Structure formats: structure tokens, C-alpha cells
Write a protein that binds this ligand. Structure first.
Ligand SMILES: CC(=O)N[C@@H]1[C@@H](O)[C@H](O[C@@H]2O[C@H](CO)[C@H](O)[C@H](O[C@@H]3O[C@H](CO)[C@@H](O[C@@H]4O[C@H](CO)[C@H](O)[C@H](O[C@@H]5O[C@H](CO)[C@@H](O[C@@H]6O[C@H](CO)[C@H](O)[C@H](O)[C@H]6O)[C@H](O)[C@H]5NC(C)=O)[C@H]4O)[C@H](O)[C@H]3NC(C)=O)[C@H]2O)[C@@H](CO)O[C@H]1O
Length: 145
């Protein structure tokens, strides 16, 4: 590791932890782990304000359902917005993955196993994000910065 916040090593799922200094343009956050085989049909990574879960700037939510698709959304003052759905599944049940979020001024760039998968254009100010959560059908090796 060569970043500036110590990695969360082998974090238990569900996980919620502080992002030191908050999201910043240029910050890269990696979630590295394995999708579980028979422990649910969904997982999510949430970039959120505090630990309540009612204000999530970016919810990245693969669903092994209806062919496999990924939901991208924002929750503000407790309410979900209109979902962006990509109708391709880049993960696989039982399989290891490397999931990398690069914060840019206009969007998150989301890379799955070294391929840019989606760009989520910010709906709310990313500076207000100070917490990352991961939940659902995954086990994690690390979350790094
Ligand atoms: C004229 C007419 O009659 N028209 C109707 C339409 O109105 C109707 O359309 C449907 O209308 C309903 C409302 O009535 C709704 O809008 C339907 O849309 C669906 O809405 C659901 C619920 O919001 C969507 O599912 C949710 O999606 C969001 C992202 O957008 C999240 O993925 C939600 O997942 C939850 O996420 C939480 C945070 O990560 C998580 O909680 C965490 O869990 C952790 C443990 O793992 C830990 O506990 C932590 O503390 C906690 O915060 C939850 O576990 C997680 N829940 C689940 C179940 O995973 C997700 O629930 C859904 O995607 C959306 N679908 C669509 C298509 O938009 C809308 O379809 C239609 C159809 O009925 O009929 C017409 O006739």
C-alpha cells in the first residue's frame, strides 16, 4: 500500500468506516474481495455522509437478478433518486474482484477488474462524503485509499 489513509484490512461485512479527509477530487478507493456464492443476490458500496445511511451520494449496487445488472443511485434526506441501471454484470458469484472508485470533478469512474465499467455523474457534492459502507453478499480482503 502507498496511499495516505491506512487500509481497512479484512473488514467484516457489513462494514462502515470513515474516509479520512472526506472524498476529494483525485482520491482512489479500492474495494477488493470475493462475491459469496449462496449468501444473497446483491451487494453494495455506499459513499455516504455519516453513519445514518440516509444520505448516500453514490450507491453502487450489483444485483445477480433478472440477467445480472448494476444499480447506481443517490439517496438524499432518506429518499432514493431515479436509478441508473447498467444491464451487464461484471462480477460473478464465488469469484474474486477488484473494484476501484476514482473521484473526479464531474463523476466517479468505477473500474472492475481493471476495466472502466461505469461513470456516475455527481448528483450531490462529493465533498460531503466522509464514510464508506459495504454490505451484502461479499467477503473483503481490503478497502484501500
Ligand atoms: C401507476 C402505477 O401504478 N405504477 C406502478 C409503479 O409505481 C411501480 O413502481 C414501483 O413503485 C415503488 C413505490 O411504490 C418503487 O418506487 C419501485 O421501485 C423500486 O423501489 C425499490 C425500493 O426503493 C428499489 O430497491 C431499492 O433500490 C435502492 C437503490 O435505488 C437500494 O438498492 C435498496 O436497497 C437497500 O439498500 C440499503 C443501503 O445499502 C440496505 O440497507 C443496509 O443493509 C445493510 C445490511 O446488508 C445494513 O443493515 C445497513 O445498515 C443498511 O442500511 C438494504 O438492505 C437494501 N435493501 C435491499 C432489499 O437490498 C433497494 O431496496 C428498486 O430498485 C426499485 N425498482 C425500480 C424499477 O425502480 C417501483 O418499481 C410498478 C412496479 O411495482 O408498478 C406500476 O404499475
Amino acid at each position: 500500500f502507498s496511499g495516505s489513509q491506512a487500509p481497512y484490512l479484512s473488514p467484516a461485512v457489513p462494514f462502515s468506516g470513515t474516509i479520512q479527509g472526506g472524498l476529494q477530487d483525485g482520491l482512489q478507493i479500492t474495494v477488493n474481495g470475493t462475491v459469496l456464492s449462496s449468501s444473497g443476490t446483491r451487494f453494495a458500496v455506499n459513499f455516504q455522509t455519516g453513519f445514518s445511511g440516509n444520505d448516500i451520494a453514490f450507491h453502487f449496487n450489483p444485483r445477480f437478478e433478472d440477467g445480472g445488472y448494476v444499480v447506481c443511485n443517490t439517496r438524499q434526506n432518506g429518499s432514493w433518486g431515479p436509478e441508473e441501471r447498467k444491464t451487464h454484470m461484471p462480477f460473478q458469484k464465488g469469484m474474486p474482484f477488484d473494484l476501484c472508485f476514482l473521484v473526479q470533478s464531474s463523476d466517479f469512474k468505477v473500474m472492475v477488474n481493471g476495466i472502466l465499467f461505469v461513470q456516475y455523474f455527481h448528483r450531490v457534492p462529493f465533498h460531503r462524503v466522509d464514510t464508506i459502507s459495504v454490505n451484502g453478499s461479499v467477503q473483503l480482503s481490503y478497502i484501500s485509499f
